[model samples]
Target: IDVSQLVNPAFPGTVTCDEREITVEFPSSPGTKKWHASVVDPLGLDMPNCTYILDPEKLTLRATYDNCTRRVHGGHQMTIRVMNNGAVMYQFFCPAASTICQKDFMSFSLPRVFSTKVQMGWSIEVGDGARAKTLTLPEAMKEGFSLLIDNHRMTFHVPFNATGVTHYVQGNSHLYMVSLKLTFISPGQKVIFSSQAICAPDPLEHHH
Candidate 1:
């Protein structure tokens, strides 16, 4: 099966909404500012996604999503946390990432400089009943971005390329999915913004 189809079995195995995008802003708090977005799954891509947008002038976290986006199914959640100078401005853990099949989950971290290191955590759950299992990426994935004082606003973009797979030892039926997640941290009492989207696979018709 192709990459997309291997993860979602209900549809023909293609991205429901390719080129999906989101934008958000993080506001600064007195101590530590914390902000989070509601659970969102625009394309029904079967993966929970969230993003934060940074605004140096306002120092606020503006969360936005396209709930009206086309989709074959529904069910997505995400959590985010932001700290400023060792203060918790925003902290949220809505729903974690999940899938029905066994597959690889890949994610990239944003490269932003900070005064100190920021902590990040992510988890994944697979299967149902007693056969289910949960896996968490190593804490090492949580690395803070470098801070650039000269630059008023900094932009960090991380790509998530994950895969999920399910195997039936006795049957030919198999299930799988692919998804991505990202976390951001900031220091220097700076406000952060974020955005995320899924790019659709090139259509086969284009080759004809």
Candidate 2:
């Protein structure tokens, strides 16, 4: 069935049906990372009538069935398990299922830390979709987290925000993805640095 047009081009796997057997395979990497297990196509199917669609980097796994077969793909609940070297964070499923504001922390490898448990959450305030998140750190405030610029403690009142369409990927379509915007105020209270990074899972904490 021209599945090529139905799935991501990066995962444009070749489906072969020989007699009574079918197999699907895609290209991938040979090495693993700190946070991500591997870049291998986790979609490779040993047989046809497959079910489930997943994104390991985004920590999303959906339970579904082969549309043509209308039968359960594989048994048992399945989800992606993320790792921090030897540490297992958690298995992720649909974080927010409704079209409302559900606040939660999304951890990524960012530079300059106030603590290991520093976090951010989303609030559903008069909204149906994900909006930009603003985190403001004040001068010398002994909070749990802080922002940085050129490896220097940014001036107080620095705001770091995440902007996107949704907290997680829905149905593998992404016209709206969250990105991080940071404004660093210099000690002189001047604009010294500013940057933005698309919110994607990372294998390591980014640093200056």
Candidate 3:
């Protein structure tokens, strides 16, 4: 199958799939910051795939899959998502560019802009209650194969044997949720990108 044609050619970067693994290269330009890739199954699901591998010291991502091969009997679909975190960084530049709304000399001065860089961190915990109930996967996975964050909703096929628990900060505490999406794909299917529903809430507190 021609995986390259199935992918979005304008997608800020490039992807090359060998017999065993797929390698995606992020653009080197300042405008291109983050990139995402995923393979969908026949049933239409978004995969919980990420280019950024979680680490302790630095937020680094590398091509990890080697010569492992999976056989697909028919045509399937795959979708990729890419974002320029630099878009978020652009907000910091606004206060410095204009001051027409300023009332005082201080307001006319440029405000302190923090760096837009992101860091990597990890944590583990056990809990009980509604949060715990949400942590259980059998129910959540059956409900749907999409991620519902505050303002962003993503639906994708997850990888086989993919199971995990993730937590999001609601107010002061965290809301634990189970992750059970799969990423297997058949042959000859098309991947589509649609707008997410509006009611979804942002899961990350910092983003709010």
Candidate 4:
């Protein structure tokens, strides 16, 4: 597939790369453990000299890959997957950027202007393609769960009014999946954040 189609900037769940870095964002949901990530090719081969870190506070995942410019001509397609507690919750594709490679580096940003309180809750859960029981945060930590975006306190808690839960299932015998729905709210505005979590037999291992 063309790199353009693989990396659609319009989608909130997409990856971007400039000369300096490759970056993507995860929904602002607190996890019981550190989030996990991996960048790999279509044939299940992992990329070399690429490493990433999950910023618990910012929910931003940044990756650094060596010689990105030299690799552009050959073209590339990589799958970046994020998981928590073993299941593959979410993933996006990344492609080599010819436009960015020509320049030393390029950067830009978009603005979302507004103000209002943001609320987060575990609204839904799904497993094995059918509705499954919901898993709530451990009682003690539930009240302390919060996240940071751009240094802003996007703190969240389990709201009492949970509409319901929806379970999701993936046919990977080695792992089980759980999907959750989160939301941000302001007066007259309700933006939902969708995320996934998969429980795997072992955590993903990637070389630096």
Best by TM-score: 4
Off by over 4 Å in 3: 1-9, 34-45, 48-77, 86-208
Tens-place lDDT per residue, model 4, 116-179, is 3655444434444454434344431332322222543222322212133122234432332334
Write one digit per residue (lDDT tens) for candidate 2, span 1-208: 7775444222222222212222222234333323442211234222344454545554333333232122223322112234455422221111101111112223233444332323322211111334323344331123222333456333222112332223444444322223343333222111111233223332232211
lDDT of 1 by residue, 99-159 (tens): 1111222222333233355533222333343532232333212321122223433322222
Candidate 1 to truth, TM: 0.19
Q: What TM-score does prediction 3 earn?
A: 0.23
Q: Model 3 Cα displacement at 156 (Å)?
A: 47
Supply candidate 4's per-residue lDDT for 128: 43
TM-score of each: 0.19, 0.18, 0.23, 0.31
How high is the CA lDDT of each candidate model? 0.29, 0.28, 0.28, 0.40
Best by lDDT: 4
By TM-score, rank the candidates, best first.
4, 3, 1, 2
Per-residue lDDT over 68-133 for candidate 3, one digit per residue giving the tens place of the 0 to 100 score: 112334421233333443211000000001212111111111212111232221111123333322
Q: How many backbone clashes are present in model 2?
A: 2
Error of 3 at 151 (Å): 61
Per lDDT, what order, best first? 4, 1, 2, 3
Error of 1 at 30 (Å): 13
